Amino acid sequence: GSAKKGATLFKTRCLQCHTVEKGGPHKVGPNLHGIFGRHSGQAEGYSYTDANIKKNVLWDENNMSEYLTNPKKYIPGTKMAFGGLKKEKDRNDLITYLKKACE
Amino acid sequence: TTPLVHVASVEKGRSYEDFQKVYNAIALKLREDDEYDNYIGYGPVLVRLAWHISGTWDKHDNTGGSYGGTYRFKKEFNDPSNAGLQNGFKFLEPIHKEFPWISSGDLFSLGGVTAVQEMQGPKIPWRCGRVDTPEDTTPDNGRLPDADKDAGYVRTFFQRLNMNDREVVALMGAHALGKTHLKNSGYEGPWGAANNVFTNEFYLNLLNEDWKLEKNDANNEQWDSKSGYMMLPTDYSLIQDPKYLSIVKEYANDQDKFFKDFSKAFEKLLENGITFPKDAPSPFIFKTLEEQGL
Ligand code: HEC
Ligand code: HEM
Numbered sequence A: 001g002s003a004k005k006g007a008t009l010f011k012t013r014c015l016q017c018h019t020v021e022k023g024g025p026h027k028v029g030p031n032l033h034g035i036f037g038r039h040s041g042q043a044e045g046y047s048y049t050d051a052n053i054k055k056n057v058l059w060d061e062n063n064m065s066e067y068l069t070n071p072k073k074y075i076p077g078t079k080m081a082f083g084g085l086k087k088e089k090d091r092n093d094l095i096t097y098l099k100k101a102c103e
Numbered sequence B: 001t002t003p004l005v006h007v008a009s010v011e012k013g014r015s016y017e018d019f020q021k022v023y024n025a026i027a028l029k030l031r032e033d034d035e036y037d038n039y040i041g042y043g044p045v046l047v048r049l050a051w052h053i054s055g056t057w058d059k060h061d062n063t064g065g066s067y068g069g070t071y072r073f074k075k076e077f078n079d080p081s082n083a084g085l086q087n088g089f090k091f092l093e094p095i096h097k098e099f100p101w102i103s104s105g106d107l108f109s110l111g112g113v114t115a116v117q118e119m120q121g122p123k124i125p126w127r128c129g130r131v132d133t134p135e136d137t138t139p140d141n142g143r144l145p146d147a148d149k150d151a152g153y154v155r156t157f158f159q160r161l162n163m164n165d166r167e168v169v170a171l172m173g174a175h176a177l178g179k180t181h182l183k184n185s186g187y188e189g190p191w192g193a194a195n196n197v198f199t200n201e202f203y204l205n206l207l208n209e210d211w212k213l214e215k216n217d218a219n220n221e222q223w224d225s226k227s228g229y230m231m232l233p234t235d236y237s238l239i240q241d242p243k244y245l246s247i248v249k250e251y252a253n254d255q256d257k258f259f260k261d262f263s264k265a266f267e268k269l270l271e272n273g274i275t276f277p278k279d280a281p282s283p284f285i286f287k288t289l290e291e292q293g294l
Helices: A005-013 A061-069 A088-101 B016-032 B043-054 B086-098 B104-118 B151-159 B165-176 B201-208 B233-240 B245-253 B255-271
Strands: B211-215 B221-225
Touching: A005 A088, A061 A088, B016 B043, B016 B086, B016 B104, B043 B086, B043 B104, B043 B165, B043 B255, B086 B104, B104 B255, B151 B165, B151 B233, B165 B201, B165 B233, B165 B245, B165 B255, B201 B233, B201 B245, B221 B233, B233 B245, B245 B255
Parallel strands: none
Antiparallel strands: B211 B221
């Protein structure tokens, strides 16, 4: 979807905890640069719950969308405190944005 | 004469199901207008409205409290410690037009119950029967707490609501939700990172962050952590009181516990001052949108 939309959704719902720029600093959440194509729990010098590491999934736009719908259902024990995006557009709009922002 | 007696009266032949419908409306709309406040949603504000309409109670003469839905009168509506709740009032006027039978008092509280459950908090038994009361029952402004105080003002402000130390520490975990808005109250910032999902972040932040006191732009002082959060005086005071501090540690350690004390307290908060005849229905447990396929 729309990547201008995804952008505000990210600034509004993910930004408090995460950066996307390269080198970007971890916050509550890991720096999300080069997320896609990496395995869950790999960002460097960020401490992940064993749960995020032991799930080891490659982040592809697809498993990523199941995740955002409900982070605790996906990776129980995860400590990311997000309720989830219940709206497909939102998910589209965001992912698309991310796709592009985390290059 | 003794205090006033407020008997809960069920709305003429309504029942759970009639009330699960109201929830659904509220619940959905929280799903729909999700852009509010930089995408925090209407969650935090509805739980804050729930608290404010109930927090005027005075156990000595039993005035104030949720019963009367008096927040709808200007006097109350305009109380300066009520700034920002108009946003919560508007969000439910629509839904009220949809269900004009439910009383104001039953709507403002059901609303906070929905928001907690909808944000993944614990289940909160709830009861109906609040009845609307004349403009004359409107509590004078000033029965709600100040932020700029310490453990001891807190302990005492709460004996008036009839709450103990554990109930006061549990209630405060609600500070995991939303943030402070300088235009509303002189303070600014969020307590944490997941402002719209209900956890015990409030307590881990309190004890794991590094707080420094500082002045905001409104010219008030607050505690800021390097991480971008803030704590009000009254929140910080929870770790400076030896007694508040061990409840805070319990909770940072065990969410279930927090989840259980909070639900017990929040509901106690919402039912204060109300007498339920022995014929009223057992408190209701509503289902979430998730539990209903949504
Ligand atoms: C805190 C309040 C957060 C919010 C809001 C969002 N994220 Fe999050 N994220 C956070 C934490 C603490 C963690 C690690 C959790 C753990 O259990 O260790 C994460 C993790 C992610 C991941 C996985 C990272 C990886 O596997 O390397 C992703 C892909 C991610 N977060 C993205 C994301 C999005 C898209 C958000 C909003 C819509 C979002 N996060 C919110 C902290 C927080
Ligand atoms: C000592 C008692 C308390 C004090 C001084 C206090 C103070 C405050 C202040 C100053 C704000 C921010 C207002 C704004 O800018 O909109 C706030 C927000 C809030 N309060 Fe508290 N509070 C107290 C107890 C509670 C309790 C007991 C609960 C709930 C069960 C509660 C729930 C909330 C929530 C959910 C918010 C966020 C609202 C939003 O995001 O709009 N507070 N509180």
